[PDB]
Amino acid sequence: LPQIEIVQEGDNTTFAKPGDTVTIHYDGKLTNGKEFDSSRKRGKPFTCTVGVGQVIKGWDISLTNNYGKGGANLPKISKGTKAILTIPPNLAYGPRGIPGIIGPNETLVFEVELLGVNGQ
Ligand SMILES: C=CC[C@@H]1/C=C(\C)C[C@H](C)C[C@H](OC)[C@H]2O[C@@](O)(C(=O)C(=O)N3CCCC[C@H]3C(=O)O[C@H](/C(C)=C/[C@@H]3CC[C@@H](O)[C@H](OC)C3)[C@H](C)[C@@H](O)CC1=O)[C@H](C)C[C@@H]2OC
């Protein structure tokens, strides 16, 4: 499943649940270290609804703590938390990927900051 490493610690009280909307700042890199996207470089944070299949599965799993099932190496991310998500080609864009930006069978690394959840 996805992998999460916690670089920094949030409030530890605010966690996203499926159907919740989250706001995130992120940089996305390949395992080789080349950046393919940054929310901050754009100057705009990303907002989405998690747990509805709106975004790739690795994002849905990490943000909702696996829909509350819990997971191996799956620590929960809270508001103000900084974490690294490693997403396998499954749970992301797969064998096809999305040209131009992503090659076939790519493992993706996201460095993310969870600015807010829902009302916040
Ligand atoms: C005209 C409007 C298009 C509309 C584009 C935007 C609102 C701007 C928004 C910042 C996207 C960025 O545009 C610069 C750019 O973000 C990336 O760089 C990226 O960091 C990424 O991977 N993200 C974004 C952050 C959340 C996780 C993931 C995602 O799941 O995002 C979602 C995603 C691509 C889902 C695919 C869709 C195809 C399915 O087949 C596949 O199923 C496996 C899942 C995004 C939100 C789409 O739902 C919404 C859109 O497409 C992609 C590398 C390519 C993507 O551009 C496409």
Author numbering: 5 to 124
Report text from the authors:
However, to confirm that this is indeed the catalytic pocket in the C. albicans protein, we next sought to determine the C. albicans FKBP12-FK506 structure. Interestingly, initial attempts to obtain crystals of the protein-FK506 complex failed, as the intermolecular interaction appeared to be strongly favored, leading to the production of the same apo crystal forms. Comparison of this structure with the apo C. albicans structures with bound self-substrates revealed that the 80s loop that is inserted into the active site of the adjacent subunit binds in precisely the same location as the FK506 substrate/transition state homolog.
The 12-kDa FK506-binding protein (FKBP12) is a ubiquitously expressed peptidyl-prolyl isomerase with considerable homology between fungal pathogens and is thus a prime candidate for future targeting efforts to generate a panfungal strategy. In addition to its role as a PPIase, FKBP12 is a member of the immunophilin family and is the target of the immunosuppressive drugs FK506 and rapamycin. Three extended loops, which have been called the 40s loop (between β2 and β3), the 50s loop (between β3′ and α1), and the 80s loop (between β4 and β5), surround a deep active-site pocket that binds both FK506 and rapamycin.
